[PDB]
Design a protein around this ligand. Structure first.
Ligand SMILES: [Cl-]
Ligand SMILES: [Mg+2]
Length: 379
């Protein structure tokens, strides 16, 4: 790949310490820099760090990279998302593109940054630290419920120069199938997607990547294809399958027990459903480049049932980009031969130096010496 393209990589690593017990990462002495160089990646998110604060002195200190890590406040060994940004050298063509101007924890904006000695401020209340887009995320969202929604280390956001915002997510799965857990999962998804729409409307170019824990389509679900008695007869016959079984492909998304699938599809401009597609604002890079013909493009397999060897899985890991970035996409694929987890990695290469793409709306933090702050002028 080219020096002018940024390579994005997402990987649910099912515990970052365990991840380093798999080949080839077991030869790398737990060095994330070696891992990112192995992938030739520039912007990387890992989900399910399953780490703890004391271990951040390892995972948040990466030579040649900025580290942005969100973990639960107290619960150890659970969830956790990291996003790492390569620091380019002065003569690298990406020197300015990769400059990080803002970074933020959570989806709601209510989490805080230490401000003084005994002082913390929420992203929502500091325009020079928060990325913005906080309007009407949910009609009932108060601080207490927002902090609950953002308490499990599930989202990091980084803003680069030129208005690109990278949102790295590990969305809830409701593994227990509890009713409270389903409500939490749906609220998380809805807030996430409204935040995306707000930032898009303000003019940010968005990259939303990570483990969304939602199948967008029947062809991404080995279990439901079997349940519907639909066999994979042609490995590149995805479009024919979706045509001949369109009634089932629709049923899959609008299943009343799984409304998260329909909610997810509404953000996808390439959704199988025309109404969803008309209102969507994000492109599924992997589907765009691999096309809807490619079947069995799975990124997770149920490990307890040992189903990865038969490639019987689902696709719940994504790199989604603003419609305005679609022409930038040079490559997008999954990496199912790479070990490390019960998921496999997903990557996409974007040529964002392309001068034909509209520029994003930037908001570079204003230095505090600017007169409005230095002399506390009225706003
Ligand atoms: Cl699903
Ligand atoms: Mg796991």
């Amino acid at each position: 790949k080219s020096e002018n393209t940024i390579r994005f990589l997402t990987f649910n690593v099912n515990g970052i310490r365990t991840f380093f017990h798999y080949q080839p990462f077991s030869q790398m002495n737990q060095s994330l820099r070696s891992v990112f160089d192995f992938f030739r990646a520039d912007i990387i998110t890992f989900q399910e760090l399953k780490t703890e604060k004391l271990s951040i002195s390892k995972w948040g200190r990466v030579d040649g990279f900025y580290s942005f890590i969100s973990i639960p406040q107290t619960r150890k060994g659970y969830s956790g998302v990291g996003c790492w940004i390569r620091i380019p050298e002065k003569n690298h063509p990406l020197y300015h593109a990769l400059q990080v101007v803002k970074a933020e924890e959570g989806i709601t904006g209510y989490l805080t940054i230490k401000n003084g000695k005994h002082s913390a401020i929420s992203y929502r209340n500091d325009v020079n630290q928060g990325i913005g887009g906080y309007d009407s995320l949910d009609p009932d969202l108060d601080e207490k419920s927002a902090l609950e929604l953002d308490s499990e280390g599930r989202c990091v956001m980084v803003e680069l120069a030129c208005g690109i915002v990278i949102i790295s997510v590990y969305c809830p799965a409701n593994s227990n199938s509890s009713e409270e857990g389903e409500m939490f999962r749906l609220r998380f998804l809805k807030v996430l997607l409204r935040r995306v729409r707000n930032l898009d409307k303000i003019g940010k170019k968005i990259v939303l990547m990570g483990d969304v824990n939602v199948c967008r389509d029947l062809i991404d679900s080995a279990d439901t294809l079997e349940q519907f008695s639909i066999p994979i007869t042609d490995p590149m016959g995805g479009t024919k399958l979706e045509a001949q079984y369109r009634d089932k492909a629709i049923q899959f998304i609008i299943n009343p027990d799984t409304p998260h699938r329909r909610i997810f599809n509404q953000i996808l401009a390439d959704s199988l459903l025309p109404d969803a597609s008309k209102r969507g604002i994000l492109i599924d890079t992997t589907r765009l480049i691999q096309t809807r013909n490619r079947l069995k493009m799975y990124t997770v397999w149920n490990m307890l049932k040992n189903l990865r060897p038969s490639n019987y899985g689902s696709r719940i890991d994504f790199i989604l980009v603003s419609l305005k970035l679609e022409r930038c996409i040079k490559a997008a694929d999954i990496l199912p031969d790479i070990l490390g987890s019960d998921h496999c990695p997903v990557y996409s290469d974007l040529d964002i130096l392309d001068d034909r793409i509209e520029p994003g709306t930037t908001q570079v933090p204003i230095p505090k010496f600017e007169a409005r702050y230095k002399y506390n002028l009225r706003n």
